[model samples]
Target chain A: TKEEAQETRAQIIEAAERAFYKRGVARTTLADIAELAGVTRGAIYWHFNNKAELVQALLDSLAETHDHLARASESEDEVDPLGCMRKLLLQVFNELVLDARTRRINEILHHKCEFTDDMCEIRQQRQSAVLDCHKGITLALANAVRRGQLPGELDAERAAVAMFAYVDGLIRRWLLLPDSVDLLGDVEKWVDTGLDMLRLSPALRK
Target chain B: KEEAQETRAQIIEAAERAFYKRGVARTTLADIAELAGVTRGAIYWHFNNKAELVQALLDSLAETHDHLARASESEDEVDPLGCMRKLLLQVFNELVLDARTRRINEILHHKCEFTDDMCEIRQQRQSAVLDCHKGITLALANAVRRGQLPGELDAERAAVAMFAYVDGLIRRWLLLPDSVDLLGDVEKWVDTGLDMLRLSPALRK
Candidate 1:
């Protein structure tokens, strides 16, 4: 019974992704998702209370995939915190290009989801995720500084915020205009450019 | 005729402030009219709807700043790179210090959502982006020709990256101003981006 429930949940989420991809998050409703999934509306209600909660589930699923990288970068005892961060960043960029689910989920997050009052829950979730990301980057940067990977004077918080914005912006722009940059081929170079800013910019230094 | 034009300008200004405060999705023509001290009838007469109002606001910004854009893209300009830098700095300064500029940009970058109903607005945005990419690439090429930047720089790629970088910075800063003082640290923050263009080996051909 548990296995069947899990399979049903997966089917509902997959249906949601398809609906959301075709029609934006704002336009797609639970009924539409249920119809797409061939499930009853009551069944959909059993899993998610609202669209925002459904989106949260989708985000949580994606976040679980990166838990290991988050831990590796945040670990103080890790021998190469910066290297771990770089590896994670590289994986993120590569997957964004190669992985359909990741790309679709990201597109939904960045473009489909609107920050209207009706979707305040989704907005709050996004804000929390951004702040958490900033915190994670800050921790990793501090560890990198301790390990001599970054300059001691590096303003970890500011650098983290800047780095997050750069990466976030790149992804948003690419999603808008995919042909603008070679995301797959130039993933390493783009990641390195951001790292270089952290490593070299005097403005980022204390 | 002059009075009618003045009324239209008032409506546009009011709409900009309202859109910035309340996102475009939430903002209404009635709200703009109330702020402008005009009637709903007046707003409808001047503009079809919110999307048209937004387009007019963007057009106004482009018209007002065309001088710098022209300078940056001109083939005969002696200091193309300096022109580009100055144009970018001016944008940063205006967004930070000028209320109207900051509000309009905030509305464009964050407040406006591209739902199916706003298809026309989305089209305008895409067109504007294409125009920007072409202009920036042209300016960057001129800068390279003038020996201001590395000769081997891929102008189109560099331009796209720069555009995305600045646009991203502005949007992110608008979202969280407490993280960084975009207004106070404008120059250094802008320089860091330009420095990437100047120094990054990846930007080179």
Candidate 2:
């Protein structure tokens, strides 16, 4: 009975996520999730008391998956910490950019769409998760320096923060003006060139 | 027949001027009609609604700028490098320094999704602008290979990055126009950055 209940709840949540992505949170109704999931409206209510609760659950699920992917992409066995950074960066970019649902979620954030209190809390949770993610990248770069792969004089934290700012600026600008911008291509080039600029060999003159 | 065409042209021109001044949403159909020296009924004859008028204005703006890309392709005495220099200068001249450009900049970045129509219009406008930037970057790369630019740079990659920086400056200037000497600083900044790039050694293979 417990397993069956869990299965029904999962189906409802999945349906709600789809509704939120397609119609947006404001327009998505409980009946819409019910129809999409092929479950009764009562089944959705049993798991989520309201739309706000459903949105909160959906956010929690996204955060869990995002953190899991970040941790899985780490390569401790590599000689330098930044060794797998590019691959990991690409994975995170794919999650945030290429994934359609994620992109819709980003649209909500960009537009500051009306949301239930639960949804707003979830947004804050995602922000914290992002900060933690940045911390991990900073630590990894510092470890690379310790491994003598990079210069000791390099300030990992500041560089990591600035790098994030540069990429954030690109994403926001691209979102605002998609017609003329090749967002991912621009980001990739900026990351490559910016890293090159920052990681100039110690012997080289600026 | 000429009067009818003239009336239509007047509506479009008035709408652009209004949008450039007060923005799409804040500027009303009545305001457009009043400025165009026509009644609301006549404006409606030309456009279904305010949204359609805004869309027309955006389309016309795009079509006018499309000529810049075509000019790059034309076999003028000036090659691709010269073409890019002309294009960038023209772009900066029109979009960066101009009052109408400043107003649009404010509209694109400042106004939130107050209405569904506004959001949709902005999205379409954004997508076309990015596409144009990509084409210009590609042309700049081809020109670099033809000995029109310094060979030391990765033109394709550099073009993309440089465009981002330029775009960033436009956005920053919109928010703080008086805070920075945009014209003097931006021109010299690009010149110095490009020169430094040329002097920098090639990345190890």
Candidate 3:
């Protein structure tokens, strides 16, 4: 029973990914996924409540892909919290360009996943996820402050909010128009620009 | 006919209200016609594509500016950096103080969702972002030549970083207004970024 449930769940998620990518989140339906996975409609409801849950699962998987680096930076004793974050950010940027899987996930996440009223759960989840990321970044910036990488008076909360949003904006712009920035070649310089703001900006200071 | 132009304006103005209320994807042009007190036939006569309508909304967002709006870009302008300073601060002022600007910006940032079919809106936003970057870069070059900024400043990099900071700040504030202090700390945040452009070695050529 356990093995069968696990197999069906995985199949359901795989089918959800396939359908979201092909038809988009708004146009996709639970029945479509059931048919795509060759399972009964009952099997879908057995695993997830609705299409929004499946979308949330897809988003969860994207977060898991990079959680290792996310953890290292936020940990208590990491010697270089800043270095870990740069690698994490650069890895994200590089893979979005070089990795087709990464590209598809994000293309679906940002462009395909429309936040219409019927499927509004995704919006709430997205907002929560962004705020969650802000908190983790705040912790990392705090670590950096203690490590003397950032100034003592740095308002880590404010700085983290700006940092998160700046990266988010850069990513959104690039996704909308890939040719706007040399994300591949200029990864270090661009990543350092945020860090530079951390080390340099007076507004972020106490 | 003047009435023809007037009717179109009413439709667009009412259209933005619709977008704000019902979200962009859900609000039909029929709904727009109803709100504008025009027939659906009249709606189709004036506009057909939703993407173009969205673009028209974008047009109004850009139009509500004056008195130090375009002064940052000209090569002949004396205080390009000063103009930029005021303009950047003006963004926060209008966003926090003006109701219409907030609604239009809110619709753009939060109320709309993009689709693959809507290539026009994406391209329009794309051009707007690139043009802003280009303008900031041009302004920085003028600042450098005028000895207002560091000689070795990489204007392209500086512009990209600056715009990312500015754009992101506004978008973030739009989402979580209570989390950010844009109204109270406008000068500090604006000058802090300008300080980064001047002080950060990583931004240099």
- The parts of candidate 2 lying over 4 Å away from their true place are A1-95, A98-102, A109-169, A172-190, A196-206, B1-31, B34-37, B59-71, B74-79, B112-123, B130-134, B149-163, B178-180, B189-205
List pairs with backbone clashes in candidate 1: none
* Model 2 per-residue lDDT tens digits across residues A1-206: 79989999989977876666555555567888999999976787788776766765765565554454345334455564555565555554566667766665555444333322333543344445456656776776666667776557766754454345445445555566553346565445445554554355222211
Which candidate comes out best when scored by DockQ?
A: 3
The candidates' DockQ values read 0.41, 0.09, 0.49
What lDDT does the true structure give each of the candidates? 0.82, 0.57, 0.80
lDDT of 2 at A65: 41
Query: Candidate 2, residues B134-172: lDDT per residue as tens digits?
Result: 675566556556666566666544554455545554544
Q: Identify the runs in model 1 with alpha carbons over 4 angstroms from their true place.
A: B17-45, B48-50, B75-78
Q: State each candidate's clash count.
A: 0, 13, 0
Against the true structure, what is model 2's DockQ?
A: 0.09
Tens digit per residue, CA lDDT, model 1, A58-119: 77777676778878999999999999999889888888888899899887776666565556
Best candidate (score: TM-score): 3
Second chain alone, TM-score for each candidate:
0.92, 0.68, 0.93
Query: Higher TM-score: candidate 2 or 3?
Result: 3
TM-score of each candidate structure, all chains considered together: 0.87, 0.52, 0.91
Chain A TM-score values for every predicted structure, listed in order: 0.97, 0.66, 0.90
